[PDB]
Design a protein around this ligand. Structure first.
Ligand SMILES: NC(=O)c1ccc[n+]([C@@H]2O[C@H](COP(=O)([O-])OP(=O)(O)OC[C@H]3O[C@@H](n4cnc5c(N)ncnc54)[C@H](OP(=O)(O)O)[C@@H]3O)[C@@H](O)[C@H]2O)c1
Lengths: 112, 319
């Protein structure tokens, strides 16, 4: 029944060392200037986070290449099998079905 | 004797000797003496590093540092020999686990009312408080009145100062409030009867001294510092949370520098607005500062931009 006590040791040793390093000398008796100087070298920066298109398409493109490796995941379990002409010719399909999705998008990526 | 402009790097005649001068009250004095320029001999107790932010005040050879225990005689008889004035502000809050706290306001202002008095000084100055009364309060608030009385025997003319309660920049008085992000906001003691006192601004108390340090003719004539406009309410504690929107200690932490489950909860609410025949601030001119102008600055929590200030008080009554 240790899996599950194989990690709750590891996280309660993790959260131990945080509060002892951070929070315990955070109650110390120094002067502790609380003035708004804590931000470094970008003093005010009175703006909202602007949209960047070339850093959105990187999120979606990965997600659609991430799905069909989980289809591709039970290939070693698909070895000790019955009829294997089917198993080979279907395994080669998905990879090409992943490969074409490159080549269409490959004619327009952008400065990624 | 003086010479030239008093901006920096002048002579200005005076040679002070300011004891203490590390805390919130003692430091901010020396800043205005490191401007007009004078041999401000500052001795310190046991702090080599904690006094380092004091050195870009004395120009070059203006200030000078010495070590001194306080109870021994000659350690405070070696710096007082070449001087013109000497002011005292030594002391603390709660009794320490090494000292005795009783004669520390009696023998120790007398230990520098020793041959210090004899050697030829003048304009020796001590401090008071507007609430230190020999009636039965408190262990700190009275036994300061011993220092008002038992040290008055020597130096029969001092101009001991009696400032009001202070709000400032790095202080402890107002900062004892709004540091109560805690399991509850408990006032003293769920009542708004005598709140509030006179929160004089710390630039005025350090401007009263430097107008008295060459006044002249202010010896023996003790002074009491007027506060802001005008009295105040319990609305203060509501006003502190209005805009806030809810040294040399140790290496890791000092395990005892507390909030004092003792007299300290009532060491500030005993008000005793004292005699208005004391002269005491405006005649030591010229200074009169409110609270609602300098209230934005020292109160500072996690909003840090948006204030939208409109909170105020009428006078309050008995104004
Ligand atoms: N007028 C007021 O409204 C008011 C309000 C509160 C307190 N006071 C008293 O008036 C003075 C204002 O001082 P402050 O506001 O700057 O706070 P503070 O923390 O008391 O600073 C005064 C200095 O005296 C030092 N000190 C304490 N015991 C000492 C001892 N035996 N020998 C030598 N130095 C000792 C302190 O620590 P170090 O020894 O490390 O230097 C401190 O640096 C103090 O005496 C204070 O008790 C006045």
């Amino acid at each position: 029944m240790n899996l599950m006590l194989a990690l709750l040791t590891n996280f309660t040793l993790a959260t131990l060392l945080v509060i002892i390093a951070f929070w315990l000398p955070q109650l110390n008796v120094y002067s502790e200037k609380t003035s708004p100087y804590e931000c470094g070298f970008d003093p005010m920066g009175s703006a909202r986070l602007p949209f960047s298109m070339k850093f959105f398409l990187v999120a979606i493109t990965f997600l659609l290449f991430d799905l069909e490796i989980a289809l591709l995941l039970p290939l070693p379990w698909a070895s000790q099998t019955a009829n294997l002409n089917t198993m080979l010719t279907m395994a080669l399909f998905l990879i090409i079905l992943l490969a074409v999705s490159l080549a269409y998008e490959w004619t327009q990526k952008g400065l990624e | 004797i003086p010479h030239g402009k008093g901006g920096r790097s002048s002579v200005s005649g005076i040679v002070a000797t300011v004891f203490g001068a590390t805390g919130f009250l003692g430091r901010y004095v020396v800043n205005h003496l490191g401007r007009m320029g004078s041999q401000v001999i500052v001795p310190h107790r046991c702090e080599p590093y904690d006094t380092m932010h004091l050195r870009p005040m004395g120009d070059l050879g203006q200030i000078i540092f010495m070590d001194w225990n306080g109870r021994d005689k000659d350690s405070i008889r070696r710096a007082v020999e070449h001087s013109s004035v000497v002011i005292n502000l030594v002391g603390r809050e709660w009794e320490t686990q090494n000292f005795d706290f009783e004669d520390v306001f009696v023998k120790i202002p007398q230990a520098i009312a020793q041959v210090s008095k004899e050697a030829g000084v003048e304009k020796f100055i001590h401090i008071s408080h507007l609430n230190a009364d020999i009636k039965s309060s408190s262990k700190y608030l009275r036994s300061k009145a011993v220092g008002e009385k038992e040290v008055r025997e020597t130096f029969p003319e001092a101009t001991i100062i009696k400032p009001a309660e202070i709000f400032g920049r790095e202080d402890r008085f107002l900062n004892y409030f709004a540091n109560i992000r805690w399991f509850g906001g408990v006032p003293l003691i769920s009542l708004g009867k005598k709140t509030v006192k006179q929160p004089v601004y710390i630039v005025d108390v350090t401007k009263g001294i430097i107008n008295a340090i060459k006044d002249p003719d202010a010896r023996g004539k003790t002074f009491a510092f007027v506060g802001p406009s005008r009295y105040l309410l319990f609305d203060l504690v509501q006003y502190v949370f209005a805009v806030a929107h809810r040294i040399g200690r140790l290496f890791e932490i000092s395990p005892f520098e507390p909030w004092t489950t003792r007299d300290k909860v009532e060491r500030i609410h005993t008000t005793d607005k004292i005699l208005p025949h004391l002269p005491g601030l405006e005649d030591l001119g010229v200074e009169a500062t409110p609270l609602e102008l300098k209230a934005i600055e020292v109160l500072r929590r996690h909003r840090t931009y948006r204030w939208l200030s409109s909170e105020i008080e009428d006078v309050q009554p008995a104004k």
